Amino acid sequence: SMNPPPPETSNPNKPKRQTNQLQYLLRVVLKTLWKHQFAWPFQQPVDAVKLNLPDYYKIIKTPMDMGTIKKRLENNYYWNAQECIQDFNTMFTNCYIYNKPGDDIVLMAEALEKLFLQKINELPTEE
Numbered sequence: 001s002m003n004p005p006p007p008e009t010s011n012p013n014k015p016k017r018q019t020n021q022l023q024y025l026l027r028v029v030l031k032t033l034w035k036h037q038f039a040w041p042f043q044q045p046v047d048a049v050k051l052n053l054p055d056y057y058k059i060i061k062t063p064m065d066m067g068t069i070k071k072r073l074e075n076n077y078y079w080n081a082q083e084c085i086q087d088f089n090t091m092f093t094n095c096y097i098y099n100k101p102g103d104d105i106v107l108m109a110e111a112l113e114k115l116f117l118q119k120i121n122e123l124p125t126e127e
C-alpha cells in the first residue's frame, strides 16, 4: 500500500559523466517520448496510494519512470548511455510484468517502447 521512496536521482559518491550519447538521450530521446500521447502515466513514479494499487510495489521491486530518468539525465547521474537505456528497459518490463497483455497501459508501453527503440537505433558518437 505505502508508496516507497522514489529512486535516487543524485548520489555524491557515484561517478558521473556526460557523453554525447547521454546528451542525445535527454535532448532527443527522452524529450520526444515525453510529448507522446501515451507518455503521461510514465512521467512520474506510480502512485500506489492515489491509484489504490496496494499490490503494485508488492510485485514491482525495481520501480522506474521517465520522471526519474529525466532528473538523472539532468543531474548527469549516469556513467554511460547503456546505464540510461537500462532504466528505460526496466520501466517497460515493469509495465509488462505487473499488468497483462491487452491492458490499456500495456498498449501504451508497447507503443512507447517501439518509438524508443527507433530513437536509440542510431546514437551519435564522440570524436
Ligand SMILES: Cc1cc(-c2cc(CS(C)(=O)=O)cnc2Oc2ccc(F)cc2F)n2cc[nH]c(=O)c12
Pocket: 040, 041, 042, 044, 045, 046, 047, 048, 050, 051, 094, 095, 098, 099, 104, 105
Ligand atoms: C506504469 C503505470 C502507470 C500507471 C498510471 C499512472 C498514473 C499517474 S499517477 C501520478 O497516478 O501514478 C495514472 N494512471 C495510471 O494507470 C493507468 C491505468 C489505465 C490506463 F489506461 C492508463 C493508465 F495510465 N499505471 C497503472 C497501472 N499499472 C501500471 O503499470 C501503471
